[PDB]
Design a protein around this ligand. Structure first.
Ligand code: FES
Ligand code: FES
Ligand SMILES: [Cl-]
Lengths: 146, 146
């Protein structure tokens, strides 16, 4: 397992740590980012995380233990590129209704800020969330849980 | 880093985990084993761990964070063989005054239960102790400390 120190992870920032040769992202979500997540539901493939792409303690609307932080494996579920992080709302290239999320540059799959995949892109499932647990408020252990 | 679950490590037992290609041993020491350590001092090369073969939080008489468990890399400091674990006191082959420890089969180097090397053997230093930290009472994370 690897320890992720989020003590300096500012609002909207993304921290990358390596685990089992894979990139693990930790995103500090703002209330604004969180407020828009439910609105994505109708446009998502698996808004309720029914596909087991995460431990049960992350099978929820924000796919996380705490709303303030998203923890997920930064690998596209289509073929494995690493998606770009696009937290800004409504950029011209992604559409005015874009509420922040991730965009895979290899074949266009899109995921929201709970790493849930949108309908009709090559990726068929929400990004994988690894087992993890908070050791304390500013330290998340990735790879193992209680 | 590598997690070592010592929840089932009984008194006197030794757990082996692999870290960076190296064998890491975790030994559950009994009070009897601990009681005998100071007596080895006069016969040891570096009883106070002056040679930096370990992190500072292990630079002490039991070369460990807690007395109950010894954590060390199981590689002989002489030429690299893997020492045998000999916890029993006074076996005929090692001597009646033997208080438990390690015996390297390749050229006879001896180390005590704090992994400290005895005088006049081929190995010149105490076995290396890797950086590590307790995640909780029965879980040790090897390869990192904070
Ligand atoms: S690898 Fe991500 S859209 Fe194909
Ligand atoms: S390698 Fe251990 S005594 Fe030589
Ligand atoms: Cl081994």
């Amino acid at each position: 397992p690897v320890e992720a120190d989020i003590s300096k992870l500012e609002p909207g920032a993304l921290l990358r740590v390596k685990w089992r040769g894979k990139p693990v992202w930790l995103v500090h979500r703002t209330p604004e980012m969180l407020a828009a997540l439910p609105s994505n539901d109708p446009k998502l493939v698996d808004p309720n995380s029914e596909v087991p792409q995460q431990p049960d303690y992350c099978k929820n609307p924000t796919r996380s233990i705490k709303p303030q932080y998203l923890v997920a494996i930064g690998i596209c579920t289509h073929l494995g590129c690493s998606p770009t992080y696009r937290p800004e709302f409504g950029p011209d290239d992604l559409g005015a209704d874009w509420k922040g999320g991730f965009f895979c540059p290899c074949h266009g799959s899109r995921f929201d800020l709970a790493a849930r995949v949108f309908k009709n892109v090559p990726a068929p499932t929400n990004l994988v969330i690894p087992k993890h647990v908070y050791l304390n408020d500013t330290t998340i252990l990735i790879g193992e849980d209680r």
